[PDB]
Design a protein around this ligand. Sequence first.
Ligand SMILES: Cc1ccc(C2(c3noc(CN(C)Cc4cccs4)n3)CCCC2)cc1
Length: 139
Amino acid sequence: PVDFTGYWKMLVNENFEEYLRALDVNVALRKIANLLKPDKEIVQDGDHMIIRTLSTFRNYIMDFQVGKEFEEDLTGIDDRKCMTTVSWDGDKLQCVQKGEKEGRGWTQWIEGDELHLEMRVEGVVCKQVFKKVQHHHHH
Ligand SMILES: Cc1ccc(C2(c3noc(CN(C)Cc4cccs4)n3)CCCC2)cc1
């Protein structure tokens, strides 16, 4: 069993530039984005998951049902759309983003007070780790 509900601050962000490059994000935006240390605010409500990734540049909000494919609008990220399914894999969330890019998806899990997020596309891997925090941030 796992519950992702909480507020989470970025601790480390490894290889994000190459991940965005593999999504063809242009270099001007990669410059802005690799400086960001976004927070995540997550509510897990049954199998209804809301993940709000919050930064000073752009936010990205996910709101989906685990196990249920949906049309994911990535306009503000890499100017694409995917048919995405996030599924349980034991206590991990395994996301497959079907679309133009091969091998696109991510895996999210918890280890103690760390939220782990591995993002993948075209064989390129970015790893982020967040720490659970308690001072709450108005947005
Ligand atoms: C050009 C550009 C690049 C990144 C981003 C953000 C970004 N940072 O990473 C990704 C890829 N994914 C959307 C992250 C996930 C959220 C939930 C599961 S995976 N976008 C920074 C914080 C949110 C948006 C916005 C815009």
